[PDB]
Design an enzyme around this catalytic site. Structure first.
Site, PDB file in Angstrom:
ATOM      1  CG  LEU A  43      -2.074  -1.057   1.207  1.00 41.68           C
ATOM      2  CD1 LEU A  43      -2.908  -0.941   2.461  1.00 41.68           C
ATOM      3  CD2 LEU A  43      -2.964  -0.948  -0.034  1.00 41.68           C
ATOM      4  N   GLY A  44       2.093   1.204   0.523  1.00 44.18           N
ATOM      5  CA  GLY A  44       3.033   2.320   0.607  1.00 44.18           C
ATOM      6  C   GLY A  44       4.399   1.954   1.157  1.00 44.18           C
ATOM      7  N   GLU A  45       5.346   2.917   1.121  1.00 44.38           N
ATOM      8  CA  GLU A  45       6.734   2.750   1.581  1.00 44.38           C
ATOM      9  C   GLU A  45       7.150   3.881   2.573  1.00 44.38           C
ATOM     10  N   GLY A  52       9.891   1.969   6.581  1.00 47.77           N
ATOM     11  CA  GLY A  52       9.551   0.617   6.150  1.00 47.77           C
ATOM     12  C   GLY A  52       8.521   0.552   5.036  1.00 47.77           C
ATOM     13  CD  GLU A  53       6.978  -4.289   3.046  1.00 44.39           C
ATOM     14  OE1 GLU A  53       6.697  -4.188   1.828  1.00 44.39           O
ATOM     15  OE2 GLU A  53       7.325  -5.367   3.580  1.00 44.39           O
ATOM     16  CB  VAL A  54       1.746   0.703   4.549  1.00 45.36           C
ATOM     17  CG1 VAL A  54       0.307   0.472   5.003  1.00 45.36           C
ATOM     18  CG2 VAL A  54       2.396   1.781   5.400  1.00 45.36           C
ATOM     19  CE  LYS A  98       4.929   3.441  10.028  1.00 47.83           C
ATOM     20  NZ  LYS A  98       4.622   4.852  10.365  1.00 47.83           N
ATOM     21  CG  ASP A 127       4.556  15.384   7.484  1.00 43.12           C
ATOM     22  OD1 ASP A 127       4.702  16.437   6.805  1.00 43.12           O
ATOM     23  OD2 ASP A 127       4.940  14.261   7.093  1.00 43.12           O
TER      24      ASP A 127
HETATM   25  C1  LIG Z   1      -2.349   3.636  -3.171  1.00 46.99           C
HETATM   26  O1  LIG Z   1      -3.561   3.025  -2.733  1.00 46.99           O
HETATM   27  C2  LIG Z   1      -3.766   2.890  -1.386  1.00 46.99           C
HETATM   28  C3  LIG Z   1      -2.866   3.277  -0.403  1.00 46.99           C
HETATM   29  C4  LIG Z   1      -3.171   3.073   0.938  1.00 46.99           C
HETATM   30  C5  LIG Z   1      -4.379   2.486   1.295  1.00 46.99           C
HETATM   31  C6  LIG Z   1      -5.292   2.091   0.321  1.00 46.99           C
HETATM   32  C7  LIG Z   1      -4.998   2.304  -1.020  1.00 46.99           C
HETATM   33  O2  LIG Z   1      -5.845   2.030  -2.058  1.00 46.99           O
HETATM   34  C8  LIG Z   1      -7.187   1.653  -1.754  1.00 46.99           C
HETATM   35  C9  LIG Z   1      -4.444   2.401   2.689  1.00 46.99           C
HETATM   36  N1  LIG Z   1      -5.362   2.030   3.774  1.00 46.99           N
HETATM   37  N2  LIG Z   1      -4.819   2.316   4.868  1.00 46.99           N
HETATM   38  C10 LIG Z   1      -3.448   2.915   4.638  1.00 46.99           C
HETATM   39  C11 LIG Z   1      -2.550   3.373   5.722  1.00 46.99           C
HETATM   40  C12 LIG Z   1      -2.960   3.401   7.053  1.00 46.99           C
HETATM   41  C13 LIG Z   1      -2.110   3.861   8.042  1.00 46.99           C
HETATM   42  C14 LIG Z   1      -0.815   4.274   7.730  1.00 46.99           C
HETATM   43  C15 LIG Z   1       0.095   4.769   8.780  1.00 46.99           C
HETATM   44  N3  LIG Z   1       1.403   5.136   8.592  1.00 46.99           N
HETATM   45  N4  LIG Z   1       1.904   5.402   9.829  1.00 46.99           N
HETATM   46  N5  LIG Z   1       0.965   5.243  10.729  1.00 46.99           N
HETATM   47  N6  LIG Z   1      -0.181   4.863  10.121  1.00 46.99           N
HETATM   48  C16 LIG Z   1      -0.400   4.222   6.405  1.00 46.99           C
HETATM   49  C17 LIG Z   1      -1.256   3.781   5.415  1.00 46.99           C
HETATM   50  C18 LIG Z   1      -3.275   2.922   3.242  1.00 46.99           C
HETATM   51  C19 LIG Z   1      -2.358   3.354   2.167  1.00 46.99           C
END
Ligand SMILES: COc1cc2c(cc1OC)-c1[nH]nc(-c3ccc(-c4nnn[nH]4)cc3)c1C2
EC number: 2.7.11.1
Length: 269
Positions: A13-15, A17-19, A34, A119
């Site tokens: 879902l993200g970087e 670390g990584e999600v 996370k 942020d």
């Molecule tokens: C690029 O597409 C997405 C990207 C993300 C989500 C869903 C997504 O598509 C549906 C989704 N759901 N929940 C998160 C999420 C929740 C919490 C945190 C976080 N980071 N640090 N503390 N909480 C990061 C991402 C993400 C990222």
């Protein structure tokens, strides 16, 4: 009930670390996990355990396996607010007003319990299945009010295009006006699809032009007079003169009817 605690890491879902998107083996419930490789996190988990609001990402718990820390957070199927902003266009004004209302509810909540996010940007604002905005990432967050005593901040935190100017010019500053400024930069991105300046410094021409009220220039030329009047009150250089959230809630555009409800199904005759 066996296997109910087993989650499958379905996709990234993200970087940072990584999600990872995690799906429950039995119930198929989705959560965002996370993955933090510790070789800070104690404060992040501590702040997350205090949080319970409809416009703040849900913290379900944490698990530590040696050097790897797993944070179990809310899955938001609408993704990031960042991907709803059309470059150099933005989004329809009624959508921006609804997202800004939800962002204010979330920031009111946080400030009420003495937490500053530090942020706020569209990358950190997530959308659930019904497109409800959620504030995420408390990695840079801190306690600015404890035992009803306010503590002034001095540390450089945030993302330069979203930071308030006092954070670059003063040694100490109040926490709340800093989060108001970043919300105002988010509102600008939502209505113009561009960031007004790289940083709120006098050496930045775009920033000088705004203090000179050259609103015939971009991004301000793309913004209607009613939300632009609000931005004039938020992006005020002096943090003491800047509009506070209780007063944002009284602003003419903030209370302007624009947006229809979610479109419920209907039949005729
Ligand atoms: C690029 O597409 C997405 C990207 C993300 C989500 C869903 C997504 O598509 C549906 C989704 N759901 N929940 C998160 C999420 C929740 C919490 C945190 C976080 N980071 N640090 N503390 N909480 C990061 C991402 C993400 C990222």
């Amino acid at each position: 009930v066996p296997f109910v605690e087993d989650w499958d890491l379905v996709q990234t879902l993200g970087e940072g670390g990584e999600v990872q998107l995690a799906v429950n083996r039995v119930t198929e419930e989705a959560v965002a996990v996370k993955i933090v490789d510790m070789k800070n996190i104690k404060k992040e988990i501590c702040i997350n355990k205090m949080l319970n609001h409809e416009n703040v990402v849900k913290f379900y718990g944490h698990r530590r396996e040696g050097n790897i820390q797993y944070l179990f957070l809310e899955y938001c199927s609408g993704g990031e607010l960042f991907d709803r902003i059309e470059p150099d266009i933005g989004m329809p004004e009624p959508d921006a007003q609804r997202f800004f209302h939800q962002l204010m509810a979330g920031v009111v909540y946080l400030h009420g319990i003495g937490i500053t996010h530090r942020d706020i940007k569209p990358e950190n604002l997530l959308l659930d299945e019904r497109d409800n905005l959620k504030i995420s990432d408390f990695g840079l967050a801190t306690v600015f009010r404890y035992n009803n005593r306010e503590r002034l901040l001095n540390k450089m935190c945030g993302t330069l295009p979203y930071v308030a100017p006092e954070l670059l010019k003063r040694r100490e500053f109040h926490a709340e006006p800093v989060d108001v400024w970043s919300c105002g930069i988010v509102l600008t991105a939502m209505l113009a699809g561009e960031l007004p300046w790289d940083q709120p410094s006098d050496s930045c021409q775009e920033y000088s032009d705004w203090k000179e009220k050259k609103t015939y220039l971009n991004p301000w030329k793309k913004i209607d007079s009613a939300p632009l009047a609000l931005l004039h009150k938020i992006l005020v250089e002096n943090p003491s003169a800047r509009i506070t959230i209780p007063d944002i809630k009284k602003d003419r555009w903030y209370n302007k009817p624009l947006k229809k409800g979610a479109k419920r199904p209907r039949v005729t005759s």
